[PDB]
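Submission sheet (multi-component)
Chains listed below:
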Amino acid sequence: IISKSYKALINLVQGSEQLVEKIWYRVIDDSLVVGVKTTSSLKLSLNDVTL
Amino acid sequence: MAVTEASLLRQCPLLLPQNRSKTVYEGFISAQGRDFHLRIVLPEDLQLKNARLLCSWQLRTILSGYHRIVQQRMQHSPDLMSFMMELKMLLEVALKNRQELYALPPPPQFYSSLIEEIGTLGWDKLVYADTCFSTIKLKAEDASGREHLITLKLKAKYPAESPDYFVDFPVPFCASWTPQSSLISIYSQFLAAIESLKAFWDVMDEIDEKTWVLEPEKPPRSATARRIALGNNVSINIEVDPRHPTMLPECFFLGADHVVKPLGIKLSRNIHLWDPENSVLQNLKDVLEIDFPARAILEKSDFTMDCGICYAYQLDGTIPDQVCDNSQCGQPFHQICLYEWLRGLLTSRQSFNIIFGECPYCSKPITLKM
Amino acid sequence: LMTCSLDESAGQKIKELLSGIGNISERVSFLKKAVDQRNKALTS
Ligand SMILES: [Zn+2]
Ligand SMILES: [Zn+2]
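Outcome: structure written.
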């Protein structure tokens, strides 16, 4: 029930393509550093991505 | 809430709008600790005049012969809110009628705690436990060596609430049930009730062995009255006080009015010669200056001690008691039979709540006092 | 094929059934709590 009733939420908001390859994270001193590589899909000449 | 934005959620938590236009609700409805499926599609506007209401096949089973009631409710109902209030009220009704499907025990409390408390008693006691473990029956002995049973009926929570305690003996049984009290508590109470009657049971067993008991036949432990027969065609009915059994009981005489007179008269002379050191029988034999016969039952197996109007013993609790004041007839009758006889005839003449008439068999004066 | 014509030991067997009741009732409580989980997840 829950699986479908949630799935419907996604259809509210939307109504495939992996835009972001992969997520990794390291630590410098006191300093968490999350980062991610793109796919040729997400152009930053045209789009203003945050994280 | 007033609005069914919030009142819908607050009354039906489990109703989730799938479609954006809140038009398909789905998910569940709550009902007597039982949630069920529901898939309730509205039209392109909010109208229940047209609505699809589909179910679990489980839900179709429980809305057996209310298919039409709820179809009415859909077309006459204003809002979806009100519909759900009604559909809940209605499920509660359907299930409370079908109330023979319910009740799972708490196994961590019950089965063990019950095995524990029966261990507390001892295993020699238990005589019956139902396969639902709802009923059990226990045994105790008197100081005399008489078996006295106690039936218990148990709830889903035995130690919380009182178990229903059923037991034969005549004075009303009282069980101080606490949630802390157990099978051993009520068992001690049961033994206490047994011994307060210990002298009483002995007096009754004594009467039942040595005298022609008539009118309880295999008496229970609940009987305090004992219709003894003496000679033939006269009887004595005896109610005994259970706390003072050896002491003088209220006793009186049935039969032919010429036979009862000297017996009553000699009881009035010799009632001060009653003594509570002897038994009830060892005081009655010296009070009335008689013996009792030992079961004139087996020799007089058909003397026709039946009404001789209707020819039955046991008409509606009543016994053949009213007799003829005649040596040659001695025919017993019933209150109902003799009254419907002597009122029907011409010859019969009534003073106030008495009828004088002729005995049916011998045509001699017979008197009936209602 | 067969044909049917129709019409110490208790010491340990009490305990074994009591162990089953323990096991069973334990997992009954477990599934009750997964039900409260799902039920809330559903509410919110
Ligand atoms: Zn009769
Ligand atoms: Zn007569």
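Remark: The radius of gyration of chain A is 16 Å.
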